[PDB]
Amino acid sequence: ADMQARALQDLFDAQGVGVPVEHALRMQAVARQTNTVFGIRPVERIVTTLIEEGFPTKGFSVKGKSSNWGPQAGFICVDQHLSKREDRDTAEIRKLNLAVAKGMDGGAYTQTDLRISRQRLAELVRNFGLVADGVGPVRLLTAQGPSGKRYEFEARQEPDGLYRISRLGRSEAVQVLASPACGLAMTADYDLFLVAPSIEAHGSGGLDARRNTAVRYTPLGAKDPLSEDGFYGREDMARGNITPRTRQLVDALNDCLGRGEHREMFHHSDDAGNPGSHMGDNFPATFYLPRAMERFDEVCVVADRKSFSLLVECIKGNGYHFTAHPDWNVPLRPSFQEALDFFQRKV
Amino acid sequence: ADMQARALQDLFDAQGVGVPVEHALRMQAVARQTNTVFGIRPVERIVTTLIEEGFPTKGFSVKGKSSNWGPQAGFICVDQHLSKREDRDTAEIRKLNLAVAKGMDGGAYTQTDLRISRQRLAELVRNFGLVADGVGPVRLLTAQGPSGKRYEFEARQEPDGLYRISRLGRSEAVQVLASPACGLAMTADYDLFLVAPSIEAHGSGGLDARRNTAVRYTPLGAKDPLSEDGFYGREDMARGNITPRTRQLVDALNDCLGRGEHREMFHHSDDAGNPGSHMGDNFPATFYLPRAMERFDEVCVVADRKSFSLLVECIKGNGYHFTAHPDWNVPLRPSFQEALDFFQRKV
Amino acid sequence: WXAXCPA
Amino acid sequence: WXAXCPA
Amino acid sequence: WXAXCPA
Amino acid sequence: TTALVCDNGSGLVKAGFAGDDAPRAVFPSIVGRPRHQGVMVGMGQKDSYVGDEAQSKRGILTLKYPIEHGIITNWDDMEKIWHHTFYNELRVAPEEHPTLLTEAPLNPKANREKMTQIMFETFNVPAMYVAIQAVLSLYASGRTTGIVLDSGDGVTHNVPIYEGYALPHAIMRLDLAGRDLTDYLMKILTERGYSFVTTAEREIVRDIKEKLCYVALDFENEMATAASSSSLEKSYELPDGQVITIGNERFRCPETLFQPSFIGMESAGIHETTYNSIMKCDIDIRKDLYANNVMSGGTTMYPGIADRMQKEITALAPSTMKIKIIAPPERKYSVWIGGSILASLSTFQQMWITKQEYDEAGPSIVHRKCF
Amino acid sequence: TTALVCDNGSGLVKAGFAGDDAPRAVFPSIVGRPRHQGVMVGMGQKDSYVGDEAQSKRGILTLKYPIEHGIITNWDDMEKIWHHTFYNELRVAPEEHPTLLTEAPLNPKANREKMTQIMFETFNVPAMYVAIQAVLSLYASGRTTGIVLDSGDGVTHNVPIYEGYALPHAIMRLDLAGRDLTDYLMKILTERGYSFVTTAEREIVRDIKEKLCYVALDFENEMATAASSSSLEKSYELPDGQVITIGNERFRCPETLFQPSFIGMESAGIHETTYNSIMKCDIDIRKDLYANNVMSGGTTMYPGIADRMQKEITALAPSTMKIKIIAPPERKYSVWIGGSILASLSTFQQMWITKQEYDEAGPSIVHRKCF
Amino acid sequence: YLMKILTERGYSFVTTAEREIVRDIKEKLCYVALDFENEMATAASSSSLEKSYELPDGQVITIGNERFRCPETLFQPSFIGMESAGIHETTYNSIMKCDIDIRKDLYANNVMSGGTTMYPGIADRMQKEITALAPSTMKIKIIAPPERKYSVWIGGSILASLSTFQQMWITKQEYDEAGPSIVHRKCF
Ligand SMILES: Nc1nc2c(ncn2[C@@H]2O[C@H](COP(=O)(O)OP(=O)(O)OP(=O)(O)O)C[C@H]2O)c(=O)[nH]1
Ligand SMILES: Nc1nc2c(ncn2[C@@H]2O[C@H](COP(=O)(O)OP(=O)(O)OP(=O)(O)O)C[C@H]2O)c(=O)[nH]1
Ligand SMILES: Nc1ncnc2c1ncn2[C@@H]1O[C@H](COP(=O)(O)OP(=O)(O)O)[C@@H](O)[C@H]1O
Ligand SMILES: Nc1ncnc2c1ncn2[C@@H]1O[C@H](COP(=O)(O)OP(=O)(O)O)[C@@H](O)[C@H]1O
Ligand SMILES: [Mg+2]
Ligand SMILES: [Mg+2]
Ligand SMILES: [Mg+2]
Ligand SMILES: [Mg+2]
């Protein structure tokens, strides 16, 4: 009933989740069908509309960072003057520019043109602190570069109904990576957080046999059979450290979305398998529960690492299991901890 | 014959006993069957109806005090502003609140909702000094907090047919502990006073081998093998200082009651084994006698400690025996005292 | 046996 | 056969 | 096994 | 200061405080030690289990009784039993309280001497005494005169006492008691299907007789009735829910007290032994002994052991004597109750062997009322 | 330092770290070697494929299981399996971490002695232990008491344990388990059209039973229903898109656990074997064993294997016993979970065989808790 | 028990009929250790005990250590998990149950009979163990004739031949008149 979406939209909006609820209900319908809990790393309020519009998404190989601000918000710049701004890690400012240039030459195609719908630019100004001077088609923009910098942005309308964009002085074009099959620029993917099948099903067949089980490389001395590129070389180059269950799920979670046939939202391995995961970077997540939770509802927003721990313990007690990434230090299954503390208390 | 219940009801009501006679006859039928005297610590006139209605009961782990007054009468508050009122032991007012909070987190579940039937609230007003202003469903209450305080209580009717309750200012909810399996709030248990099998049967098998025979901890100096938590740790954590006879009896005294299958009235060790017993706190008790007494009738109300002594001497002379709690100083068996005084009078 | 052991 | 082999 | 069964 | 009264019978430790009407601690004199390999690192480390802590936890343990026929046969296990009595069951520092122990009459001097050595040197008890159990049964019966058929787990003994003078030459003792009746019923049940055979199964057959068994008032007629009819066949449910049907051997077990030849024992039964103990007495006291056959200790608890005793003594006694058997309900603890009497009497407070006296006089002092 | 816990069952290596709630590595104990001629100069040079690396890449390989009925039958392939476990799956230098291995009860001493030889001499493991898998299943069940019907790929064995004392004389073992059920379903499917016949086709039939098969609650009525109706005919899709329709043999496969005569095996089923293992126990423990039939290992995962077990034991048990089957969702890994418990306990850190002790005492030291 | 101890070596005898192979393995190979802990030390030290047997299909089974651990179960019933005194303690405890005046003659006449007394060294082991229990002046004599395997039957042939016995038969007429109680004539 529409009230379910109505409430869930406010649960999302208060928590600053950027998943469109019209997708959250389709993903939960897949969680229910596959009897799997899974999670999505944060999707920002910024991106919401781009996902609704039906742009391609960042996919796996695309190295780039992606902006929360300006008209380029929710896109990936490759004219990364953001590089001096987006995180301001000084080594990142030059070196992430050049590594993105390496990625830019390979799998990504490039578009030297933003194509903002005015209604999209209006929503931007209405929400995300763009400053807009408009004579209708004659639009230009102003923004804050989150080191603290201020800019002029020379938009131009086109017969497209979509504005091109550029920054001050560079007033012609901006280059936002664009999927090599489509013509449209890629936005942020739904980066899976974890996949946690019902533990009766966990490890059936090979389904959860992650391609690198111990995820992060460390050398084992003289007897080590795998070099670092021998270790990472058995990641799947398109999906990363995928598992057959994760792969089947990121098929089903694209087939259910009614998504455009080259416009998929999920591309790659769950973050429990990503050797570059950071835990305090995953939140707020959304997790999809096949059944009644037990503070959440069955598309549950996880706000912070302690709320994630409470979710993990509720998942693992309902019988869903996921093999955590080494750096996570999640809580142990309740029926485990209640045995471990039964024996640690000398019996 | 119904006159037996008719007389026994007046024996109860004059003495202010709150056991429903329709239960007293079922418990005496068990006393007769098991050839066991046993006692129940006081059940108040306040509680009577709650036990008739079929609420869960306080069980063992639930630390809380329990009220005799207001609509919360006969329930256990955990919004214990009663704490400044219920006994007015100043150290109890803060510290029993916080210890109840510890208990509240563990074994008890909580309900932030009283659910008084209007007929129950009417009986309350008819008896226990609630002050009630009613436009039918639009009910609210007024009461005395037995330090001397007066209150307004904002009831609200519900489709339940049952009123929620709250106090002045806090006019939404009150939290009365509720058994973790059931949804309903727990009322006062039938706390066994003593169990006194026929002395031919006393100590057969292990039946009366109380888990802590000398009940109250005192240290024995350097050679003591048990620390305090080593001593209390061999109490049964669910039943307390149970004995196999007491356990079998609190099975039979639940099976006979026709009680609901998670709604048991007796949970735990007889007060002869409770290291926190107080004698002047046990009265008026009801004791169930397998046979004709010899002022009582065979479900006998004990009004005061001297009437308890007279009962104990009549029990012990009929041949029932119970190992008293250290703090009791009960009379000695008649056929004992008549030998002891035979020899103390130098023969 | 009838009780105590298997036969 | 029906599966596994040709017949 | 060494005798009795295959392993 | 209250004394302990500590009736360490062959079967149950009964311990408590003087001037209290029954023992606090009543638990079997068994020390079990685990007969199986511990694998759960944590709880299997407890070397041995004592008393009721080991009658449960039972099937894992070989259960050894430290006392047999009233004689302590294992002393490390009796120090375990007493350590648990004082510090786990009674929770009393024995350094603090006098200790009235008890033992059977006519048994080795080494038992009083070792009990007293252990009380004075392991438990440091301040003063102690070692009463004869059938004297205690008279203090418990509130009378100075009577022949006490105190029958326990280990021993049945008569001590005739008259006006407070025991007649030691008339003291009978049988090493025939509830344990020989347990081991007999444990055989008679194998005439039916049931093979109780280990220790711990001994405790099932013990509970089978402490429940089902009764004394036939006329044994040959109960045998004829049980062969005729199923009307005696009470049934019992073993610890695993098997139903055992008993019937005929329900009364043949305690008949062993009246016909010791059943347990292969060359002896007079307890009726003949009581009567023969009265005939050992001076003829002038026999009227009062016949009128006061106090019974005490647990194996006198069988239904109809009085009345059978009365019928049999009345068949022996000379037809004008008021044969009266005194079998109070509490007889099960009468030895302890009488020890609580005794240890309460002001005239008794001189009788304690104080540790100073034991140190000066040496272990001969303990035999003060020897029998 | 975390220990490894390394449940090399007959079917799957389950390996991980102690004090973690499930294995990281779970991959089959198979070593495939290519049965066909390599022609592409470059990748066909890999001599052999281990675990999940070889269950895919499957139809090119003859798949050999190193362990059969819990006994390691090939050691060069078990060193491959363990080399891949430590250095490719867990990525741990075993030189660094103690290793809790496991094995079935009642199996050759040569298996512990070769496992320990290999751990100390190929992998240089600093210290190690070799736990019985059905003891681990109790640590995983958080209880000291119960009869563990641990049923695996290779072996089904009951170990009754009570209060932490295993009763080794009551340990049953069947060489009847998920692999004999695989090879049976692989035959029963040829009553329908389907000829699964090679290894690798063994892995299709394995997945067919790990998916479709369930235990009949009343086998003769499920047979009557499946002969009456198509309502049981679930279908499965083979790796090449052929649809296999199964139906009747959907439940006849795991019935082989309760009627081993199907796989031609002279044995009691697992219900009779569990009950017979309880009857081997002391009567005083059987109530608590009946109330704690822990189930563990993968072939206890069939839908309705509990409940069928409960119905059958309740038909065997004596009508007053609370027959309770404990079949948690994680039972699939309970042996490993219990090994993670065990290797985490502080009381356990003395139990490791250190390599120094193995060098001084020789290989007899490994049989510390033998069974 | 031997059917289990053999699985410490490779051999899994497990069915009935395989029970009959292990039966024949002990009726052939097994013997009683005269000093069990020294035979264990010797068999751990040396292959000198490892007799081998050939299964019904020509597999050769090598046994050795469990060759004597099987019948040790008679003297240490705890091996078969059984709470009991061994047969030496059980024989001695059965003599102590007797009247002291007969024990000299019982100690001098420990007849052995029936098949499991056929193990090599079950006498002598019995004698050593009873002599360790018996009070050092008793002539502990174990009578283990070669025919002991059938001694129960041979003694039944004696008994049924005695003229004094021909009255002891329960005749069918007596069984019909007295009913089944008559059969317990010498009950034990
Ligand atoms: N699953 C997986 N992902 C990987 C791996 N290596 C690199 N990645 C990539 O790292 C990326 C994690 O950081 P970001 O690129 O900032 O994620 P995002 O969702 O775009 O966040 P933001 O908009 O703030 O830039 C996502 C993933 O495509 C891998 O081995 N496995
Ligand atoms: N049998 C037993 N009870 C214990 C033990 N420790 C705590 N208790 C608890 O103490 C409680 C005694 O005081 P209350 O909680 O006031 O009893 P009540 O019947 O609820 O009385 P009121 O309504 O006036 O509060 C009952 C019992 O659950 C123990 O070791 N043994
Ligand atoms: N009610 C009873 N009926 C029959 N036998 C009993 C009964 N109570 C105890 N017994 C037996 O008597 C012995 C217990 O004797 P008791 O005298 O109480 O202790 P102790 O023998 O140590 O003095 C045990 O053999 C027990 O089997
Ligand atoms: N869910 C399942 N249902 C039925 N059979 C299963 C299931 N999971 C595993 N099995 C079977 O049990 C075996 C796996 O057993 P498991 O105990 O997990 O490993 P191991 O046997 O090595 O200890 C395989 O035969 C597999 O076919
Ligand atoms: Mg991504
Ligand atoms: Mg209570
Ligand atoms: Mg006694
Ligand atoms: Mg296994």
Numbering used by the authors:
A (entry chain M), B (entry chain K): 24 to 317, 326 to 378
C (entry chain G), D (entry chain I), E (entry chain H): 1 to 7
F (entry chain A), G (entry chain C): 5 to 375
H (entry chain B): 188 to 375
Task: Copy text verbatim from the article accompanying this structure deposition.
Bacterial human pathogens secrete initially inactive nucleotidyl cyclases that become potent enzymes by binding to actin inside eukaryotic host cells. However, once delivered into the target eukaryotic cell, the effectors bind to actin, resulting in more than 10,000-fold increase in nucleotidyl cyclase activity. Our structural data together with molecular dynamics simulations and enzymatic assays reveal that specific interactions between two independent regions of the toxins with F-, or G-actin lead to stabilization of the catalytic center of the toxins and high enzymatic activity. Thus, the enzyme is activated by an allosteric activation-by-stabilization mechanism.
To decipher the activation mechanism of PaExoY, we reconstituted the complex of the toxin with the substrate analog 3′-deoxyguanosine triphosphate (3′-dGTP) and F-actin in vitro. We then applied single particle cryo-EM to determine the structure of the complex at an average resolution of 3.2 Å which allowed us to build an almost full atomic model of the complex. PaExoY binds to F-actin in a 1:1 stoichiometry, which is consistent with our previous biochemical experiments. PaExoY is composed of a smaller actin-binding domain (ABD) that is connected via a hydrophobic core to a larger catalytic domain with the nucleotide binding pocket (NBP) in its center. The ABD adapts to the surface of the filament and forms two extensive contacts with subdomains I and III of actin. The central contact region (amino acids Ile-222–Glu-258) interacts with the nucleotide-binding region and subdomain I of actin. The other PaExoY-F-actin interface with a buried surface area of 750 Å2 is formed by the C-terminal region of PaExoY (amino acids Lys-347–Val-378). Indeed, deletions of the 5 C-terminal residues in PaExoY completely abolished binding to F-actin and activity, suggesting that unlike the sensor, this region, which we term “anchor”, largely determines the 1 μM affinity of the toxin to F-actin. In the active center of PaExoY, Arg-63, Lys-81, and Lys-88 interact with phosphate groups of 3′-dGTP and orient the nucleotide for hydrolysis. Stabilization of the pocket induced by the interaction of PaExoY with F-actin would therefore explain the strong activation effect of F-actin on the toxin.
